[PDB]
Structure 1
Amino acid sequence: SMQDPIADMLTRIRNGQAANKAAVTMPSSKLKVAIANVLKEEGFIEDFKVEGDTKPELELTLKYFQGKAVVESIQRVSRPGLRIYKRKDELPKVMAGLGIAVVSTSKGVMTDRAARQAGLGGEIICYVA
């Protein structure tokens, strides 16, 4: 059964990028939208939009630069079978800081940069590079 919707979102992006899809559409959720913001603000995706009430559908618009897809990699890190939580001092630098780790902190979802600045650790959702 479906037991990790985040991994499913990351996979929809990963696959959609590989397939040169313009946009990818998943079922929405608060946490998915929260991640979509971080990917938007850091400039990995172009835009997103939720649509619907009973069954909302998130819809990420994907970026390509010089032909190539912008999301080089995108890896689930914390997963249901093994949760990863890091303290502020032990937050991961993805691709020597050129990529992001999306971190759920007590003050919401954010990059590991933003979490270092805010002085928070938390659950490491994914790496992006």
Structure 2
Amino acid sequence: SMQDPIADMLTRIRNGQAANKAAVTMPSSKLKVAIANVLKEEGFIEDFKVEGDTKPELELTLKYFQGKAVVESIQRVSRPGLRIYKRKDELPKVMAGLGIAVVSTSKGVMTDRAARQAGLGGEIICYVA
């Protein structure tokens, strides 16, 4: 039973990067598009696009820099069954600022750094390094 779509997306992109794939098509979602927007903004991916009327499908394009995959480690944090909620003071920092610790809060899902800048906490979604 598919009980976590975010984990499925992370697994798909991590396997595509390992297998040196070009595009990873998957069934999309509102949160998937919101996370893909953050990935495009942070430059960890190359492009994301939602193509579908009745069943929307996200087709992300993998980004490669001199052979090495741009994303080093993708990790789910607040998996279903263990929810993590940290305030503004205790927001995580991935790889001493070299990685993102994406946070979802009231003002959308922008990123950990933007959440700290705005002064609001939230729930951790994905660690991308």
* TM norm. shorter chain > 0.5: yes
Q: TM-score range by the shorter chain?
A: over 0.9
Give 1:25 deviation, angstroms.
1.0
Give 1:30 deviation, angstroms.
0.6
Q: Name the count of aligned residue pairs.
A: 129
Give 1:110 deviation, angstroms.
1.6
If the length of structure 1 is used for normalisation, what is the TM-score?
Answer: 0.98
Give 1:64 deviation, angstroms.
0.5
Give 1:66 deviation, angstroms.
1.2
User: 1:71-128 CA distances to partner (integer Å, 9 max, x unpaired)?
Assistant: 1000000011101111000000000110001111110012100000011111100100
In structure 1, the gaps of 5 or more residues are none
What percentage of residue pairs aligned between the two structures are identical? 100
Counterpart mapping for 1:30-45 below 5 A:
30-45=30-45
Q: Structure 2 CA distance, aligned partners of 1:32 and 1:120?
A: 22
Q: Structure 2 CA distance, aligned partners of 1:93 and 1:41?
A: 18
If the length of structure 2 is used for normalisation, what is the TM-score?
Answer: 0.98
In structure 2, the gaps of 5 or more residues are none
Q: Structure 2 CA distance, aligned partners of 1:9 and 1:52?
A: 17
Q: Structure 1 CA distance, aligned partners of 2:2 and 2:69?
A: 27
Secondary structure at the aligned position of 2:61 is classed as strand
Q: CA RMSD in A?
A: 0.6
Q: Structure 2 CA distance, aligned partners of 1:84 and 1:59?
A: 29
User: 1:43-92 CA distances to partner (integer Å, 9 max, x unpaired)?
Assistant: 00011100111100001111000111001000000011101111000000
Secondary structure at the aligned position of 2:96 is classed as helix
